[PDB]
């Protein structure tokens, strides 16, 4: 057979050889037909099958590529599975009335479509920019987001335009006031939302930012300043053994996707001796930043970045020593390109270790801290940095000597912008960030998904929330009124665990194990989400926003597991309405289903309200978010405690060295 | 005259040679009187006297110390000035109800009291330890916080009693049952709260925590991890001129005293030439740390760390390489003994930069990143730890190249523990975390003390929530419900300030000049506090706790600047019983003072609510705690954009690289 080899991991994303062997197989399939690729991925094994084959000699599940096609002249998309031991589609379908993520191909083409459509250069004439300048005329390519004048009847893109002075200015500070809206499969446009108050080109100088620019801008640059070198002259601690990571007795699987970007798995700690299961798989899903301008047409910008374009698809290759510093293990990712052929993106996840301040400290006051024990941390760092358009978003996976996961996210690059005229006011919907720049509010939201097999199989989730002792003051029962407690609510059904962050008890959610306890608290052992970057939904209830991210409206989304419930705005999120039974909505369904002590799917909404301010511009300072899962109940003791102490003296060592006591 | 040498800055802590200067003429005006020094630091200059000199030429600050003395048979205390200058106690005043700070000396001597005492010796033996096994006893010396049965009329501590098998055992795994209540001042136990219920020392094995230990409970140590060496060949960026500080812009004096611990003054940014101020003062004024068991007499443990024993006199002499690693810069602290003579606190401060992961960055899409341009950061740490009994406080103060100043905290050391009987249930109260061990709930409040000079005097201070638009879905004004803004609501007098924390609007207040515009955003010049780890304060209305910490009902609390206004439980903590017009409370009056455009106060309450687990025993892996201070719309663009960049390639520059176009 013809197959492609198979990976060393079940879970290994696919090779080049695999995607290669997928595509020609649809081509087989659909032999006499146009058709062209949009996506090419693994279909991951059932998770059922993975925990068997992993833990009960089970088989070894078949290697399965998902697809996802175009063919000229037909609505929609068609998708379906490859199998690849086989080479044979065993499953396909077509979905005439929903639009497929935009890859870089697709959104590469349009700014030159409208650079060279009539009705657009007609627009730049009067909007002071020349005809023969065109090629000073720049756009974003955005997905529509959801535009009701076309639904999904045409796959569509809106451009945010802009203007450089130079091919090296930042356009940002001159976007210009109108909005083409292009047919990405016939490649023109079919129409332009031109605003009703009509603003020309901003005549300021650009608002750039490289040395060149900023010598002019300012004095000069600041001198170079003495290095801060960091070195591991005997290597790391951590071992690859392919995508498998081991490291401060944590094992994992460091998948990628062209979606979610980094993909963690079958994550375990190893309790000396005792390899306990902590997470099956975790990643972001979905994310959407919803802008606050009421105005028209930028009620469409809300883009889901991860859905939408794909937070694999605009990662960024690592430049090493700049973005990752140190000694640092690359990963590289493989997509397909639209004729079938794979395409690499060199380093896209880069992995390395760096010290994390002090892991535990403590000194006996008697002896003047002559008794003292202190260890230095150290933190594994699994990262990329991906793209998307304007926006940096720079994620890190951490994992801790203390048993903790956290996921540290830096949030960079330039503001969205929009024009503002001289006699314009920005507020309250936005900022004037620069002469005749309007950097509109907006938020950053993501949906953390998180499939848990907290020391084993059949799990349950739950809010605490501190609360005062429900007795008075001067009562037998709470005399000093001092006593407070920790309110646990176990999610019963999925409708239980619609829950928000709630500073008025300091909120914290579990993910445990009911079947198990712990032999010196009596709890069931658990993880611990403790977040509270938790930004209320600001749009209405029944928004476009709200509607296309149901999601984004609870902090909190706990539903049974299901394999494939992935994505929960949909598989397929550009230009749908938000209408239906489908993703988070379709999962939730009537609210009633089972969650407590069964297989289920923790989905966690967090993220930031941005109110831009000139600091933001023109490049923005890394805007930092972070949750943390920690273990609660899980061990007996800290776990970090036979590590070797950075140092260590005891009360007898510290009187024989003391002097002679 | 023998005054002593005036010190280089206003600002800088009392000299060695200053304080027994100090101590030599407060004993000459008590001549003849058997007195003893409680307290000799630094009384800092008048803000306005202070400025006057710095920025008009006026004159000298007189340099003056407090001091603070008990006088054999004589209740409470008597508290004064000395002008250095003229060596003459200027100011002096008895203040007979009230108890003073505990320095490390009143502590000292507690174990070896109880320890001789025939009462307590009787309770260890009937604890089950042998009258000749006494020094197998131990005790952590506590303020007796506040006891209705003595109030000021004695200075008492609490003695929290413990058990080692051995003299290197870490004794929180024996807590005995029994609380001897010592008097001070005459050495020597005048009661013993003893439990109704009877639990008699733990016969388990002590939990401990050095490798010796781990060695015997686990296999073995982990191996030494290969080694992370930092570096700075070239020395580090930053510059110190006796305790002034300049780095990245920013300068600002380091003072510390025996209470406050670190305190930074007079912070300015450089902006070009443009020396702007920031804050005249930032310190930690005032913690407490409530228990949550109504239970007798644990009520009695809501320590004010800061304000009952001293941050200054409880902090670690640093130790490079471990505290602080790689090239670092200390600073020594000053304080008196009993006797009136100065006593040194080696490497008391430690100042370092570090790398801090990416400043910014952004790359176009459009060459496939080709062009880019990535800095990174190097952050600026100021700390120190101090150690309050079982529990370890590491205090990082740390500068951004963004003009962002934050507080990170640490909390690390030990859990403070109870004796728990084997039948006995740990919660609702606390977590069993060892056999035999009660971990009580609690939590940990600091008021961050704010003297805010927002680019020049004349400040105010606001709230601003994140709402959606009052308009609904579908109006004219809010057609998609996307709309949303943030409120800002200005405090017009310290009533109005009196706000918390609320997730429900990601609240985040304003400390700004409402005397200058930013000439892009057409807002005021300001600082940002965003903090989101700010617990209310569990403890009922009218508690103990709360009448003794009025500062922490509220996340923020904005008073009129007043000089000496520091200490917002009042300036003599131990035993006050929290009735009366004194600190916070005596601040905030009626709460109709104008706050908005004046000097004023601002004292932010944040910490954490913590609820035991084993996973904090035997000794807790470090609890992170932090907040921000970030300045918006106080620059025109992002301040760090003329460092030079770790990586940066333009368009054109991309074009003739990439190949030839
Ligand atoms: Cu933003
Ligand atoms: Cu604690």
Chains 1, 2 share one sequence.
């Not at 990662?315 to 510093?325: A, I, Q, V, Y």
Request: proline fraction near 8%.
């Amino acid at each position: 057979s013809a197959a492609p080899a198979r990976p060393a991991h079940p879970l290994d994303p696919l090779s080049t050889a695999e995607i290669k062997a997928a595509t020609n197989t649809v081509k087989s399939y659909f032999a006499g037909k146009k058709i062209s690729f949009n996506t090419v991925t693994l279909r991951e094994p059932a998770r059922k099958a993975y925990i068997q084959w992993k833990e009960q000699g089970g088989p070894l599940p078949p290697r399965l590529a998902y697809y996802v096609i175009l063919e000229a002249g037909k609505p929609g998309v068609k998708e379906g599975l490859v199998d690849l031991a086989s080479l044979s589609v065993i499953e396909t379908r077509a979905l005439e009335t929903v639009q497929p993520i935009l890859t870089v191909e697709d959104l590469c083409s349009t700014e030159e479509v409208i650079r060279n459509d009539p009705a657009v250069i007609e627009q730049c004439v009067l909007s002071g920019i020349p005809a023969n300048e065109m090629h000073k005329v720049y756009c974003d390519p955005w997905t529509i987001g959801y535009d009701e004048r076309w639904g999904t009847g045409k796959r569509l893109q809106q451009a945010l335009v802009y203007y450089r002075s130079d091919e090296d200015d930042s356009q940002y500070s001159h976007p210009l006031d109108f909005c083409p809206i292009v047919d990405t499969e016939e490649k023109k446009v079919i129409f332009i939302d031109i605003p009703n108050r009509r603003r020309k080109v901003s005549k300021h100088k650009h608002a750039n930012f490289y040395p060149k620019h900023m010598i002019e801008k300012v004095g000069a640059m600041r001198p170079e300043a003495p290095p801060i070198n960091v070195t591991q002259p005997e290597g790391v601690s951590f071992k690859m053994t392919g995508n498998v990571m081991e490291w401060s007795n944590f094992k994992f699987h460091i998948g990628f996707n062209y979606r979610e970007g980094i993909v963690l798995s079958d994550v375990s700690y190893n309790d000396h001796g005792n390899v306990r299961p902590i997470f099956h798989r975790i990643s972001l899903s979905e994310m959407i930043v919803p802008f606050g301008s009421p105005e028209f047409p930028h009620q469409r910008k809300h883009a889901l970045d991860i859905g939408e374009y794909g937070a694999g698809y605009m990662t960024n290759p690592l430049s090493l020593g700049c973005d990752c510093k140190g000694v640092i293990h690359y990963l590289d990712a493989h997509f397909s390109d639209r004729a079938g052929d794979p395409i690499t993106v060199k380093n896209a996840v880069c992995i390395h270790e760096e010290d994390d301040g002090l892991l535990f400290k403590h000194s006996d006051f008697r002896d003047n801290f002559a008794t003292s024990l202190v260890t230095r941390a150290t933190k594994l760092v699994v990262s990329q940095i991906f793209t998307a358009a304007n926006y940096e978003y720079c994620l890190y996976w951490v994992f801790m000597q203390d048993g903790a996961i956290r996921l540290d996210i830096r949030l960079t690059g330039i503001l969205n912008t929009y024009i503002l005229g001289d006699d314009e006011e920005a507020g309250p919907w936005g900022t004037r960030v620069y002469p005749n720049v309007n950097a509109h509010n907006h938020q950053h939201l993501f949906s953390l998904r998180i499939d848990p097999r907290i020391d084993g199989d059949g799990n349950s989730a739950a809010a605490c929330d501190a609360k005062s002792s429900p007795y008075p003051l001067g009562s037998p029962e709470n005399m000093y009124g001092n006593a407070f407690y920790s309110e646990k609510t176990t999610f019963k059904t999925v409708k239980d665990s619609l829950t928000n962050y709630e500073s008025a008890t300091g909120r914290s959610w579990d993910i445990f194990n009911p079947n198990k306890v712990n032999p010196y608290s009596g709890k069931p052992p658990s993880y611990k989400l403790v977040s509270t970057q938790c930004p209320p939904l600001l749009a209405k209830e029944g928004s476009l926003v709200a509607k296309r991210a149901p999601w984004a409206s609870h902090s909190v989304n706990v539903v049974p597991y299901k394999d494939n419930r992935l994505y929960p705005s949909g598989d397929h999120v550009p230009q749908w309405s938000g209408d239906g039974v489908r993703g988070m909505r379709e999962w939730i369904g009537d609210g009633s289903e089972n969650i407590d002590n069964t297989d289920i799917l923790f989905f966690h909404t967090f993220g930031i309200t941005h109110f831009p301010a000139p600091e933001d511009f023109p490049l923005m300072p890394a805007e930092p978010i972070t949750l943390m899962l920690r273990p609660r109940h899980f061990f007996t003791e800290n776990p970090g405690l036979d590590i070797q102490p950075s140092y260590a003296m005891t009360t007898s060592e510290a009187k024989r060295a003391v002097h002679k006591e």
